[PDB]
Design a protein around this ligand. Sequence first.
Ligand code: FAD
Ligand code: FAD
Ligand code: YJ6
Ligand code: YJ6
Lengths: 489, 489
Amino acid sequence: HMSKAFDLVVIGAGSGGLEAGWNAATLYGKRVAVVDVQTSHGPPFYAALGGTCVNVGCVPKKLMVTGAQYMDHLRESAGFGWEFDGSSVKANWKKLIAAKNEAVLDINKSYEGMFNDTEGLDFFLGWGSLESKNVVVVRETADPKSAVKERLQADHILLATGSWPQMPAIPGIEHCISSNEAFYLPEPPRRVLTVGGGFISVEFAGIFNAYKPPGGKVTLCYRNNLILRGFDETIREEVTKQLTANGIEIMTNENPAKVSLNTDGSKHVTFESGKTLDVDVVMMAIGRIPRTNDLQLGNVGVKLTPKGGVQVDEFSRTNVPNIYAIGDITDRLMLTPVAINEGAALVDTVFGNKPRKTDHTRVASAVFSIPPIGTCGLIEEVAAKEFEKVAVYMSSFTPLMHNISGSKYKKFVAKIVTNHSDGTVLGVHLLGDGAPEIIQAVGVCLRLNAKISDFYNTIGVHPTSAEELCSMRTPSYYYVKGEKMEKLP
Amino acid sequence: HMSKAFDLVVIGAGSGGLEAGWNAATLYGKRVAVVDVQTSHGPPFYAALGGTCVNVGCVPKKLMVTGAQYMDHLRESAGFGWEFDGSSVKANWKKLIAAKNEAVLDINKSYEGMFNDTEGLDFFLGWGSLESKNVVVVRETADPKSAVKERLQADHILLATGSWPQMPAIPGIEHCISSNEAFYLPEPPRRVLTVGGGFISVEFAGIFNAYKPPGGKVTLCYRNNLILRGFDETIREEVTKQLTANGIEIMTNENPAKVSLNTDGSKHVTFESGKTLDVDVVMMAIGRIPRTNDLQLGNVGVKLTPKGGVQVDEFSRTNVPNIYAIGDITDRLMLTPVAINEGAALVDTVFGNKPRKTDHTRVASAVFSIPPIGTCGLIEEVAAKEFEKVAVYMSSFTPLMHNISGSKYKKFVAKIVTNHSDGTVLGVHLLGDGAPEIIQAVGVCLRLNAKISDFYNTIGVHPTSAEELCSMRTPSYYYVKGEKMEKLP
Ligand SMILES: Cc1cc2nc3c(=O)[nH]c(=O)nc-3n(C[C@H](O)[C@H](O)[C@H](O)COP(=O)(O)OP(=O)(O)OC[C@H]3O[C@@H](n4cnc5c(N)ncnc54)[C@H](O)[C@@H]3O)c2cc1C
Ligand SMILES: Cc1cc2nc3c(=O)[nH]c(=O)nc-3n(C[C@H](O)[C@H](O)[C@H](O)COP(=O)(O)OP(=O)(O)OC[C@H]3O[C@@H](n4cnc5c(N)ncnc54)[C@H](O)[C@@H]3O)c2cc1C
Ligand SMILES: O=C([N][C][C]C1=[C][C]=C(F)[C]=[C]1)C1=[C][C]=C([C]N(C(=O)N2[C][C]N([C][C][C]C3=[C][C]=[C][C]=[C]3)([C]C3=[C]C(Cl)=C(Cl)[C]=[C]3)[C][C]2)C2=[C][C]=C(F)[C]=[C]2)O1
Ligand SMILES: O=C([N][C][C]C1=[C][C]=C(F)[C]=[C]1)C1=[C][C]=C([C]N(C(=O)N2[C][C]N([C][C][C]C3=[C][C]=[C][C]=[C]3)([C]C3=[C]C(Cl)=C(Cl)[C]=[C]3)[C][C]2)C2=[C][C]=C(F)[C]=[C]2)O1
């Protein structure tokens, strides 16, 4: 019936909080408490022990995109001489969802095990909030009036509560779902609208498109001209064509104004334009917002940015000296490995006596579109605002295997962006099979300040898509003080 | 006086020959003649315009491995909810061969077009040999007494005739085939013996295993204890295990003593051990030897190594001034990209004022086994004879998608070999889906003298197999003065 005392209390057992907690306890012998709202994935709170990534993010979406790729594989097999009864082919969504659920539960169960087993690393179930500088309260619900399960005394407090889907305030929003519900749909939708131009909308569009019943149709809508803002424009344009080529309708310059129920219970969507669409599911994927609401940060005066994130310095420190924030709650790069790196850096700094800041530049990342994106570093239009002379090396071709497969639309894109003044690689952008696998080691290259000549003097592995990166010596074009041109004056 | 005058005569229109020829003409404005024995692929001379890679190597074999992969994709799809009539599934070899033939013939025609469209680059059909220091004779056939077609006066001669399958001197060797004939088999063989432990025997075993008719069996035999000599030991053991899991019988410590014809037109193999096996096809893949016999190298005194390669210095010069050799004929690294690099280097040296030598260390390479190998730099047993303290970082697991697919045997292997005294990455060895793509940029990393800490300080792309390379911090074991031990002494 007594409070417990820790060196470190972590609110959120996800990618950042688990890295921080494990490292503090096992590398530096600190007493660590980690709080989360649920021990295993799914409703009601979706995220759980292991975080968004394990439960309703990276791990399950990747298993589901892997399942969806078999639609391409089954059709593309025919060109290589594979024969079977095409009329017999069915996509069983319930088996996919059941296989994903057992894989996720197995990870939930192993994290549970690590906590029951490790010296000075304890798990507390419930909703963590800040009572004071040195006390974390664990309550039965997000409501600050719900019953107190524990009070955790903390010399240091880490906020790592991640993010949550954003729902626009439109009439009939209650007829719409987020990515969270999409993971548990009992049946694959015949007709689905995915709202948003980001990786989550694109990734789900691919998944629904493979698993849709026979009469089915996937529509993606986006309020602006071109999906996947922040990615290379050539790649943005090519992914649009390859989604369309695979039967996904892309509605750009369109946004839902309202949703109502038809008498048959299907969703009637009215866009701002006055266009209408009937679907069985409306999935909002317009963005994710920092999960700061439930932490009662007012109790200790932890400052939020204008945009809603916990404000931090380069060492993840809030304005309250012993309170830190890492991961999606800081509203910057929303990636698992960035959250993990921030967690490991924080603990080495606070407990390890070896200060270290996370480098947020030159981070490798992927989109598991079909086919996928792999990217690291600057897109050319950003490079062009910070460097007087920028060169772009571009190779774009239908791979030979896709001339046999019949997916001629599957153009491989490889782009390298440089500072032409010294040849430093600023950015590498890939579209096509293996692009996420190719881009990891490119991340090491950029952290070692690689120049285009470091790439072109490296001997290719043949035959691969990757060898295109080691075969480009003459720019396709330049930017000179922000202006695009084929040649230097 | 028809005879014609050239700066460079290249014998062999292959990987190395065409790089050299193209660069000499388009970069250095030289007069270039290139000789090959055939304009397009296949019987009777197999190699042709484009070289071994284009016609009977890398390109057709990758397309045929892509075909073989579909056997795994169709089975694995079931775990992700794909349902279809398994009984109706058949692999059509003839359709694969015809699709490969059209892809390759398109490349042959494109190279024809390249000669026609390029100034100072001329193609001659026929058999090239050395008449004197500065004359290349082109005859109708490999016979030195056949009709002369051209006599090419040349300031510089490039030997680039590549390699040829080694056939052992055993009774009934004439009832055996090589990789050359494998590319044109009218029917997929029902029982086949691939002879050799190297990458060609392993790749073909996979190809024949996918396309074998019902009741068929692929056997691979190797004269020593463990296949794929020169690859990482862990990967050699695991690929052996994974080939066995996919139904390929691996016969180690076995070597054909003789082959005889059976009355049904099948082959009767007797091993040195006294064991016997009946097969439809015996594919010998025990090695490749330099293609030097038809060149009449005795006419000018070009020196050969004891092994049969054309002896060259670091700049690809023979003992005879103004005569060079690149690619497989030099019997060093038999990889297309290495031949291409040597060709470029040679032309830069001879006709630029840019003396360049090919670095034959830290060349990335692949085996298109199912699943595949990607490797760059030293295996631990070679590292441990050149360095006092070697650390080995090792990661080995079934990827989660293969727990769902049911191919539980598909262990991904990642190994980093370091100079432990200073953390320098010496070698990276990968077995798993994507390994050939993951390894290309690793090639670039080893030219920026990456340390293990440069890998583990790089932020991961999640979820990928590749991120394993950025997640290994602690050696699994070491070699100290050549001797393996789990701990530093
Ligand atoms: C659909 C989807 C796909 C994604 N795909 C990828 C991808 O492929 N690659 C990638 O790198 N990233 C991906 N992401 C992003 C990645 O999931 C996040 O960047 C990462 O999980 C954030 O880690 P974190 O530690 O900040 O928070 P999280 O991992 O979100 O963990 C926060 C935890 O805190 C808990 N929590 C919240 N409030 C409280 C409270 N008051 N008390 C206690 N516990 C609380 C939550 O239950 C959760 O478990 C994806 C995200 C989504 C939604
Ligand atoms: C089955 C197989 C698979 C392979 N897979 C790969 C792989 O995946 N990756 C890789 O990097 N390497 C691979 N290789 C090796 C690769 O093909 C060679 O290393 C490369 O082609 C060698 O280039 P080269 O310029 O030395 O000769 P080649 O490309 O062989 O060119 C030699 C040319 O000379 C011609 N010729 C020969 N004698 C004469 C003469 N007297 N006069 C005129 N012309 C002549 C031939 O017709 C031929 O076109 C593979 C090899 C084989 C056999
Ligand atoms: O498919 C693919 N990819 C993937 C991989 C592979 C391959 C093959 C196979 F079978 C499978 C798979 C492809 C297709 C194509 C290609 C290439 N390319 C490209 O752009 N590239 C370029 C080239 N390279 C470099 C240079 C060299 C030279 C130049 C001139 C003359 C002669 C020579 C080469 C190469 C080649 C090849 Cl094939 C590869 Cl793969 C790589 C590399 C670069 C490239 C191209 C494009 C387009 C066209 F139309 C053509 C072509 O790709
Ligand atoms: O499947 C796969 N692969 C491929 C990719 C993928 C994923 C997912 C999906 F869905 C699909 C696909 C896998 C499985 C598993 C793995 C890994 N691992 C390994 O062994 N590793 C280790 C871990 N990691 C690293 C480290 C970190 C940590 C530690 C401790 C605590 C905490 C943390 C993990 C990670 C990392 C990173 Cl970088 C990120 Cl970003 C995330 C995560 C890894 C390695 C493991 C194994 C086994 C088990 F059971 C589990 C796991 O894999």
